[PDB]
Design an enzyme around this catalytic site. Structure first.
Site, short mmCIF file in Angstrom:
data_model
loop_
_atom_site.label_atom_id
_atom_site.label_comp_id
_atom_site.label_asym_id
_atom_site.label_seq_id
_atom_site.Cartn_x
_atom_site.Cartn_y
_atom_site.Cartn_z
N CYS A 1 4.62 1.32 4.96
CA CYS A 1 5.45 0.49 5.85
C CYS A 1 4.94 0.35 7.29
CB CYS A 1 6.91 0.94 5.85
SG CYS A 1 7.37 1.74 4.32
N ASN B 1 0.20 3.46 6.43
CA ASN B 1 0.94 3.83 5.25
C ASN B 1 1.57 2.58 4.66
OD1 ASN B 1 2.80 3.69 7.60
ND2 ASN B 1 4.35 4.27 6.08
N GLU C 1 4.14 2.14 9.93
CA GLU C 1 4.53 2.86 11.14
C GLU C 1 3.61 4.08 11.37
OE1 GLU C 1 6.01 3.45 8.23
OE2 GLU C 1 7.12 5.33 8.22
#
Lengths: 12, 727, 577, 145, 12
Positions: free
Chosen positions: C279, C277, C281
């Protein structure tokens, strides 16, 4: 700038 | 868990306790160091199957990073860890081999010169090995080790392996320099010198330390070449410069004789530019390495063009930016400035006898000068002495490198009869003041090229002033021996060397010494101790050289010295010095005087105060006569930041007068003048300015000129960098 | 940004406690009468007392008439205009809801392929991502992904570079360079990397994610076979380019695609993870789309939450917190609506959760540990064993109660394989806490009843969640003790939790001697984490000779990350002054 | 840009008269047997003697295996993300055939309407129009209304 | 800028 000579020593 | 790659390929379990044991050994004796701190810092960087070399430089560096003024002994922890590594790197163990065995291997490998084995027998080596204390490697500071490892220790430059350790360097330097001595005294002189150097009483120039004991015979770090007013000489000079910068010598070029633009033609600057490419011929990408300082008189017809040679905004033909300049000045000129009058500019070629007299005889200069100004058949140009000085002072200020040579002081207070062997220039850093002759051609046997044979007493390592006697014997002798040992690319170089055997021995660690006798630079509080210290240096030096002349004969041209005429430094120094110090002379200059007249000196000059950078880091010492800018000093390296704390910071922080806390320049200049009293050559003296100490942050020309004047008043021969703090 | 309020007039209508109670009441609105108010009470308590944090859309929206609560999506783009369009369309629909986008775009064939290539299409994905933003510049962010060996890679890596031409640059999205073991080995062995257009090398792209052995075969073959269009580059050079753009922009990211698949809850051969995604994670399966409404696409979304490690009195509190958290999120999965059918499928198929931590540094401070020295490796190991276990346990009995997720069968979980079986080995060399819980009892229970959720844990950054609980942001150490923001009400200052008693216990970001300690903790976290971790690398130039960070260092940390099985690498921070 | 030729190797395979006769033969391939060669002959004549001109795609393509000959399209965009997307998609498909685009976009509601407005969407129509071009800058043009 | 008036006072 890089030294490939010690690089190689590394274990993945 | 965790594995480790051994020296070649083998792989063992990480021995955590071997590491720890090494650190505890290294931390032995020290204070305020945490071993676990070092471990936590370096352990977190280890990875399964990490090279053994890397375990070492990691812990080394972890220690290095903790070096601070609050924990100075991190510089010792790091040093010792680095020392231990370098032992294993050269010997495959901490325990070094026997001397003989080491030297033998080393000749096999062609890294040591095999005349060492020729000039000494197996127990002559056996013996010297008992002189050695490999434990002194423990006294080095980390910065010092990085210097040793960087530029002293014999090592393969490609592969990067190190072959010796510092103690061998020292013992072997000593053995070569004294290789010629009678059997009776030889190992006795060797032992003694080794001791002086291993315990930092005497420092030596980098070429000497890295080279002597290897197969090279070039050890030169700076030369002076005087250029005549001819294409033959211009060429010759240029050729000699190439040969020398190719050995990484620093160049001093006197170029003031070259006649001015328009003379019956294209003038100085195109030739200077040529001297510059010469100086740059073996450098970097044609820009970096090999430096030169070029000299001219103030009154040279072209002088206004010359002074701005380093100025950023000019045209290309207007500028010769990559060399420093030394403006040559005498009393008359200053008097014109103060009397608010004119200075007359003459092309040398148009004024017979003037140039010569400028250096050798002020009285005659004043006559020939006033005459030619009047005689108006002679091409001239008049300028306002204030204006002319201001130009010089501001370029000096903006570039930090337009220098000043007081040519009268270099000749009235010289060891040379100005009429026979004038001093008419300096070297790159303005501490060297010796006779030079132009060359007809690179091989003209009648040129004189002056070179600098240098050394230094560590004023911080001597327990008291009388130690300087045997130190002065050691130092002068070793340098004199080198004079014969090394080779000369150019015959004119050889002549100066052999003719006058000129030495330049100076001091390092002066500020530290001053700190620990509780004095300062700025307040006058040191004038007397300085006077005492330099009387001691000059006396012991001259004494050492004197009995060397007894033993081996005065230098071939000793007869052109004031020394031969019984004239001493103490007879010809600048008088106003009496108004600023009053220590009595403590030694018998008259007994010495007589001895000199009788047997002469082995060396025409003995003392010069050079800057040091490398010599003094290796001994952990303040740099020559300079006060330290701060308490911790930083350099880059491709191993991280190297920090070095000032000697005995713990007990001396308030005793130091750091460079920028000096209220101004006077105290310092007085100390330099007092030094000059005994110094044969000259001193790399600086002027410093902190703009934030003046109204609206600008240093006034009034001030710049008062300090110039103060310098002259106290008989200061040259003036090197001007520093200007920033922010 | 939480409290129901009139956006025009500016009046506020609720207060925080109602927000909390009503969030709870909606999420548990479906439960049997017997347990319902009992679950509601309990969740309300966990949230009102900051044990559990929830994403902003969920907190501001749930209990209002909306049914959109999504904060990030993953879309995989196939090598066709139909798919390119579809992707683009799906991006528009999502950034219009202010979702953060993750776009896998590596399949798109290279410039010159039998044509105009990637960049013009990327640019298009960018205007898409920016379609409902500001003055076309501010709001709506995306991270776009490609393999390292993509033929165009040297153009791609410099996409954010200031000085270029217009067609050369696509500056307003971040990038994720996808890397596997083989490539690194080429770097260390000082050899070449070969660049291939995906379209020209059958089976290679696929294997890159699913099977390293096969990648190595197909790779060495195609390099040899010289009918195939290729381009060779020096592995050092190529890495250096990537490392320096990463350094200068702070946002060229790294995905270790082998680690995301050998240490995944998904059978790489059935449902590979081939992207992240925005960011880094989130690590979940995706399928390209034929058309916006292609019922056979998979769009992954992030259903997020977090335990406040600073609010738990001890590790066993995480059991009931894990029940509450997993249940509430699972309920939301059914509550919310799906703009795109491919989104719905992933959600309903695999019911994927990402629950993580906030306040980690504070917790570490108060157990008197630090990031930099290794002093936390074990406590970390203990803490994340506790999280993963209690999470999986909570999901397990939810499967008992309500059935495993439709596609539970594509999990390694279904095959009795656990996080503790497939984590990267070198981890043994840096921690040695024993597992304290019965992974074998759990293992068996999972095999029997399955998991309600295919993934349970992901460590996200938090910014807003953690300010509301006065907590350090996820796993990050604080830059300083007081943190400042602007607002049109003046400067908002917030002091770190328990600063009074803990100032010396904190290790503020910039006092870490380097990156290793942190990376070790991230690797140890990864051991139990189903998805991935927004891990940072930081550098203070004033700590290096002449102020420049050496490429050697940049690369050693990249390597350290891989060695400890680190899945992704997010921002690189560089202090200034 | 008319004559059938290998684009790699660079060899030319036909000459102009065949282009003309074969363009005619394809376009009239459907006609009743009675009139067909009569229409073919006549058209060939009109074109070989420059009485009638035809667009480049038609001249280069008809008689080859392609069935795309379009040089310009008009697409009207409604005021919805569905339509905005659709338009954009249709633009991609068309500029990929090197069609010139005409986009009516005036229905899209203004900035601040109960939101971010036209321009961000226009920009999107632009990258669409540029999606199969050069270095993302050259080829494929559009006029928006 | 300079004052030559005090300058002169100086003793060389």
């Amino acid at each position: 700038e890089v030294d490939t000579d010690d690089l190689s020593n590394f274990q993945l | 868990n965790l594995l480790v790659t051994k020296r070649d390929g083998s792989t063992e379990r990480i021995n955590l306790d071997k590491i720890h044991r090494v650190l505890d050994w290294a931390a032995e004796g020290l204070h305020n160091v945490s071993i676990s701190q070092v471990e936590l810092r370096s352990h977190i960087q280890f990875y399964d199957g990490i090279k053994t070399s890397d375990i070492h430089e990691t812990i080394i560096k972890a220690a290095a990073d903790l070096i601070s003024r609050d924990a100075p002994d991190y510089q010792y922890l790091a040093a010792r860890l680095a020392i231990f590594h370098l032992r294993k790197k050269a010997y495959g163990q901490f325990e070094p081999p026997a001397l003989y065995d080491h030297v033998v291997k080393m000749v096999e490998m062609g890294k040591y010169d095999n005349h060492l084995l020729e000039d000494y027998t197996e127990e002559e080596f056996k013996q010297m090995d008992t002189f050695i204390d490999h434990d002194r490697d423990m006294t080095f500071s980390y910065a010092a080790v990085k210097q040793l490892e960087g530029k002293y220790l014999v090592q393969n430059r490609v592969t990067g392996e190190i072959y010796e350790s510092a103690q061998f360097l020292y013992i072997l330097v000593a053995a070569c320099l004294f290789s010629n001595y009678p059997r009776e005294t030889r190992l006795q002189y060797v032992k003694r010198f080794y001791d002086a150097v291993s315990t930092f009483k005497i420092s030596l120039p980098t070429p000497i330390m890295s080279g002597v004991r290897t197969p090279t015979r070039q050890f030169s770090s700076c030369v002076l070449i005087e250029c005549g007013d001819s294409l033959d000489s211009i060429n010759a000079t240029s050729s000699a410069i190439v040969k020398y910068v190719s050995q990484r010598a620093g160049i001093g070029i006197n170029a003031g004789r070259i006649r001015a633009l328009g003379s019956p033609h294209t003038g100085c600057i195109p030739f200077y530019k040529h001297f510059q490419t010469a100086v740059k011929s073996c450098s970097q990408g044609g820009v970096r390495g090999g430096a030169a300082t070029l000299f001219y008189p103030m009154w040279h017809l072209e002088v206004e063009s010359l002074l701005v040679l380093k100025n950023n905004r000019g045209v290309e033909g207007n500028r010769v930016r990559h060399m420093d300049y030394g403006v040559q000045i005498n009393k008359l000129m200053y008097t014109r400035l103060l009397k608010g009058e004119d200075i007359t500019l003459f092309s040398p070629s148009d004024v017979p006898g003037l140039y010569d007299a400028f250096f050798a005889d002020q009285e005659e200069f004043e006559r020939l000068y006033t005459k030619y100004e009047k005689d108006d058949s002679i091409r001239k140009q008049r300028v306002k002495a204030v204006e002319l000085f201001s130009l010089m002072m501001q370029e000096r200020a903006s570039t930090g490198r337009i220098y000043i040579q007081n040519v009268d002081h270099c000749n009235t207070h010289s060891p040379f009869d100005p009429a026979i062997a004038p001093v008419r220039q300096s070297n790159l850093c303005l501490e060297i003041a010796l006779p030079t002759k132009p060359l007809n051609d690179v091989n003209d046997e009648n040129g004189e090229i002056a070179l600098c044979t240098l050394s230094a007493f560590n004023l911080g390592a001597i327990n008291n002033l009388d130690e300087l006697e045997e130190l002065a014997i050691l130092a002068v002798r070793a340098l004199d021996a080198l004079l014969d040992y090394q080779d000369y690319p150019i015959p004119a170089a050889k002549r100066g060397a052999m003719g006058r055997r000129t030495l330049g021995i100076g001091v390092i660690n002066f500020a530290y010494y001053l700190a620990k006798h509780g004095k300062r630079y700025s307040d006058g509080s040191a004038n007397n101790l300085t006077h005492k210290t330099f009387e001691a240096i000059q006396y012991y030096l001259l004494k050492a050289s004197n009995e060397l002349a007894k033993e081996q004969g005065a230098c071939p041209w000793f007869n052109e010295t004031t020394y031969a005429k019984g004239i001493l430094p103490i007879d010809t120094y600048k008088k106003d010095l009496d108004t600023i110090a009053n220590e009595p002379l403590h030694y018998d200059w008259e007994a010495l005087r007589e001895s000199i007249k009788t047997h002469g000196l082995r060396n025409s000059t003995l003392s010069a105060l050079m800057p040091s950078e490398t010599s003094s880091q290796i001994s952990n010492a303040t740099n020559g006569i300079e006060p330290p800018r701060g308490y911790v000093s930083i350099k880059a390296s491709k191993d991280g930041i190297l920090r070095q704390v000032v000697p005995d910071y713990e007990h001396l922080h308030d005793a130091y007068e750091l460079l920028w806390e000096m209220p101004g320049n006077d105290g310092y200049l007085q100390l330099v003048g007092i030094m000059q009293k005994f110094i044969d050559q000259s001193i790399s003296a600086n002027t410093n300015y902190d703009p934030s100490r003046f109204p609206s942050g600008k240093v006034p020309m009034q001030q710049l000129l008062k300090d110039l004047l103060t310098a002259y008043k106290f008989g200061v021969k040259t003036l090197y960098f001007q520093n200007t703090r920033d922010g």
